[PDB]
Design a protein around this ligand. Structure first.
Ligand code: TRP
Ligand code: CUZ
Ligand code: CUA
Ligand code: CUA
Ligand code: CA
Ligand code: CL
Ligand code: CL
Ligand code: K
Ligand code: NA
Ligand code: NA
Ligand code: ZN
Ligand code: ZN
Lengths: 586, 568
């Protein structure tokens, strides 16, 4: 297996890294581990204007007021248990959002603030028959309503909820109230079942309180039951949200139609569906184990055919100190991070299952040291029935001395590991900024990107409609529209000339500049910066982009093209002239 | 030798401009891996730069801008060698210069350059040390720019060359020039600096007699512009008569790069539209300013013909120059002293090799090239169009930063490094030239204004966990020690303005903490022994969780707290 990609060779896989609390998504080539692109999501990006442009702020909605995000869990949409390359979804723990990225244009095209919850953490996608739902955990228990009269987490109306978002429309589909809280989640290979770990069955707010119970659980959701209750109108709504809300709590020990609670030690964390569809595997964290839930026993469990919820557990291998996450090679082996022991442990799932039946067998095949304190790990195509067993990335949280010193803040260490054979081999240390938690890999042939925009792309269709109200044809027009104290500049750009090279406004005018890059050539992006006004954005071929700012300073103000485009790139410039307020009314 | 395997360390630091994204990036060389991001003009969700009170204090009023446009990173020097103290960088978008402290890898000072638009070219005094940062303002504007005069040919429409005091990060002086400024460099004595100029067959490089500028400032022979106290000197020609501060050397044509050879002999201006570089002999500049030379062209001692679109030049310390050819898409290696002999008319081929790069190179940078220790080992060429060199990633493409081995007689291409938002230029330093702190100093100036605020409240930041009430303002102070915040709950009134100040009292390297207030747009870093603070308004009643964002401990998910907001 080639590990080094020389000049002129291409990577074999795409990698999509979460940006952690930096808030973006990063596109890597694997196995070189080089960053090919950054996709802004919850961050404000100076380069492309994401968070400054009207198109990006329209997608972010009211949450455009936040300049931060905290993303952990990127996942690729699936059809019949295989990646289909349409969408990537990712969470925001900081401001309780889910974002969707279109993989053809490599941009965030949709974003939703999940109603009536705090902190979207766990996120994964339905696998079968396709990604109809995005499943997302809200991690923190809050009052309902959270109006400041009740603060107690033990009140009967304090809880968190499991969230399902319609993947295609990016509107809420339903929410399920749960006992305890929610950490990570995954889905089966049928569409009926999803599952989430819980670490706060105690509903506590202190460290000792959250660690009291010897077992918390993984809560299993019967999605067919949930959908059936929605179609029946058997639901409530919270606050001003019309989202159907179903109650998955136990009441006096009697189970809900929608959930079952499988006791699992202890503050369990990762929740990972094996690629053969046989198991939900929960990592025991404070317990030196993983618990293997047999998905084929779940129908009977929900049908009352088992006496004890623990009867769906068919394995609980002892692996080492601080198991956090598990991934799969598609050869029947699982790979789990040990945060405390600072290792990845390779183990055989079927042999673990036989040991749980008392058959003394050594299911542990290898422990590999990693550097240091691994969190997530990801094997290539592990989330699909095509899991290919070639590459493994372990994402470690302390790099210590593995890289040159760079001051008190250190990089993370995302280590590439060859698992194509019986022996795991560490091949590359990848330093990264701001804690990627998880990543996801796709084959080169599973991702198809556009090279030039379609003029009808929904990303800027609202801007096209604004232009139409002004009688503007964006592919041709270079015009300044005046409207009271609003000025709407429309121009084409064809390097090295802006189609409008100067325009005049009154001090205090609200100026919108809309630029349509009518170039037809690949890799010729234009840019637009207004000097000393905090204005910057990208305009790629056939894209329309727009930005709005106040001309608060009298005088002459230069604008220029930022994205290098030409040998005469230094000279693609223009001038905004701002007449002083004292020469105009009031 | 280019492979840095697991457990092995890079030999050099690379400091990459963040381009239109606004940050500075620290790379390991030769692996070309990104070790750290240093936020400067961008708002960084991870560390809170642009959100925290410490960062917004450094940014000043320019904290209102969320963008920057970076190009030209340079490291401070003592005796013509990197001293590892500071990195400086430009902001073309909002006309700023920022200083980065290389011991903490943070931006610690920032200035908006008065009465100019767009800081682009930037380089440092070399000798006797980096007393001044020299910065080009690119665009001609009216003076004053108050909306009465828009005419760019007006006698009071011009741009200026800028000198910033490197140590105080206050303006030192400004010099009015004819034309537009492009790039700039400085000599190895401190007397001279030079810049290419591209407005008005032939443009020029303007040479500054900094000694003459300094003498005028000290005698009070200057004006000021607007409400800035910056001394302003007039370096324009007047009725064909020269300033005492400047000489204009004719150089073809729309010249671009302006690079000082590491032997100190030449300012080398890249010809761009002319397939040449022009070599200005620095040892002839005293005679030029003394009126001893018949013609400003007499300081030109070489004009090698190199190829189509020369843009920038760097040096191996062995006597060779390396120049990017933007149109031919190559790096050309040539011998400077042989070029000088050719200019006198000898038949001698000064061109040694042309190496194809991919594609359209702009800046290039050889290791230690800006110092008299230029070591001839590594060369990075930064190319604008990566085309098919990397996997496709949609309509936007990465820059291709290519690593080239120049240690022997033949340049060898060894690595293609894709980068985001057109870094444009970079600088390298030996590992042993950079010395960084493992943990913060409690007296560090970076958070000294916060320590002062704490003092007024009677707070010992190293020990206290206290909530101060002051009208509708609430100032929370706490220590943090993974996995526990020192204040785990507090209660305020709806509408209160809450400041949270956190001191990480861990002493273990790499155990950084974070602080995020859910659904309030609040995020920041607190590394070992740092104090960080952030201010927000509690505009939502109810219970609102806060949590640690930096994975710090097996119990990281559980390092949380509660803010309770009583309805108005
Ligand atoms: N929010 C109300 C006041 C109010 C509501 N609930 C309260 C409880 C305590 C004190 C004041 C209030 C107005 O002003
Ligand atoms: Cu958010 S948690 Cu193990 Cu995923 Cu990092
Ligand atoms: Cu268009 Cu530079
Ligand atoms: Cu403190 Cu994570
Ligand atoms: Ca628990
Ligand atoms: Cl997980
Ligand atoms: Cl230069
Ligand atoms: K870390
Ligand atoms: Na939305
Ligand atoms: Na300042
Ligand atoms: Zn440059
Ligand atoms: Zn240049």
């Amino acid at each position: 297996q080639k590990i080094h990609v020389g000049p002129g060779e291409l990577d074999d896989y795409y990698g999509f890294w979460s940006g952690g609390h930096q808030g973006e998504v990063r596109v890597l080539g694997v196995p070189s581990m080089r960053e090919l692109m950054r996709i802004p999501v919850f961050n404000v990006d100076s380069a492309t204007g994401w968070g400054l442009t009207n198109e990006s702020r329209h997608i972010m909605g009211d949450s455009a007021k936040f300049l931060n995000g905290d993303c952990h869990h990127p996942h690729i949409s699936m059809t019949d248990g295989k990646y289909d390359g349409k969408y990537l979804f990712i969470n925001d723990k900081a401001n309780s959002r889910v974002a969707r990225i279109r993989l053809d244009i490599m941009k965030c095209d949709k974003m939703i603030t999940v109603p009536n919850v705090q902190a979207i953490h766990g996120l994964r996608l339905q696998k079968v028959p396709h990604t109809k739902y995005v499943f997302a955990n809200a991690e923190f228990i809050i009052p309902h309503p959270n109006d400041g009269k009740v603060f107690d987490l033990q009140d009967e109306n304090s809880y968190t909820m499991y969230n399902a978002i319609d993947a295609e429309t990016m509107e809420m589909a339903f929410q399920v109230i749960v006992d305890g809280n929610l950490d990570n989640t995954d889905a089966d290979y049928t569409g009926r079942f999803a599952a989430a770990t819980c670490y706060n069955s105690e509903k506590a707010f202190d460290l000792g309180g959250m660690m009291r119970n010897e077992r918390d659980w993984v809560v299993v959701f019967d999605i067919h039951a949930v959908e059936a209750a929605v179609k029946a109108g058997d639901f409530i709504t919270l606050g001003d949200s019309k989202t159907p809300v179903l109650d998955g709590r136990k009441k006096d020990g009697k189970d809900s139609k929608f959930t079952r609670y499988v006791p699992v030690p202890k503050n369990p964390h990762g929740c990972n569906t094996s690629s053969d569809g046989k198991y939900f595997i929960a990592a025991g964290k404070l317990s030196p184990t993983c618990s293997m839930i047999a998905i084929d026993k779940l129908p009977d469990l929900f049908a009352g055919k088992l006496a004890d919820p623990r009867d769906v557990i068919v394995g609980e291998p002892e692996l080492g100190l601080g198991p956090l996450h598990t991934t799969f090679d598609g050869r029947g082996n699982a790979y789990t991070t040990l945060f405390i022991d600072s290792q990845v442990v390779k183990w055989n799932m079927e042999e673990a299952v036989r040991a749980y039946k008392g058959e003394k067998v050594n299911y542990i095949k290898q422990k590999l040291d990693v550097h240091y304190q691994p969190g997530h790990l990801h094997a290539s195509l592990c989330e699909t029935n095509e899991a290919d067993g070639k590459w493994l990335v372990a994402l470690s949280k302390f790099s210590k001395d593995r890289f040159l010193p760079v001051g008190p803040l250190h990089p993370e260490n995302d280590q590439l590991i060859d698992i194509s054979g019986d022996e795991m081999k560490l091949v590359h240390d990848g330093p990264t900024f701001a804690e990627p938690h998880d990543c996801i890999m796709a084959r080169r042939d599973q991702i198809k990107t556009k090279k030039i925009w379609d003029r009808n792309d929904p990303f800027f269709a609202p801007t096209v409609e604004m232009a139409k109200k002004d009688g503007i044809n964006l592919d041709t027009d270079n015009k300044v529209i005046r409207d009271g104290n609003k000025v709407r500049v429309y121009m084409t750009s064809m390097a090295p000339a802006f189609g409008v090279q100067e325009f005049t406004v009154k001090q205090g005018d609200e100026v919108t500049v809309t630029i349509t890059n009518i170039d037809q050539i690949e890799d010729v992006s234009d840019g637009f910066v207004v000097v000393n006004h905090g204005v910057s954005m990208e305009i790629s071929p056939q894209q329309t982009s727009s930005i709005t700012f106040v001309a608060d300073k009298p005088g002459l103000h230069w604008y220029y093209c930022s994205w290098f485009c030409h040998a005469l790139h230094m000279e693609m410039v223009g001038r905004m002239m701002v007449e002083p307020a004292w020469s105009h009314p009031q």
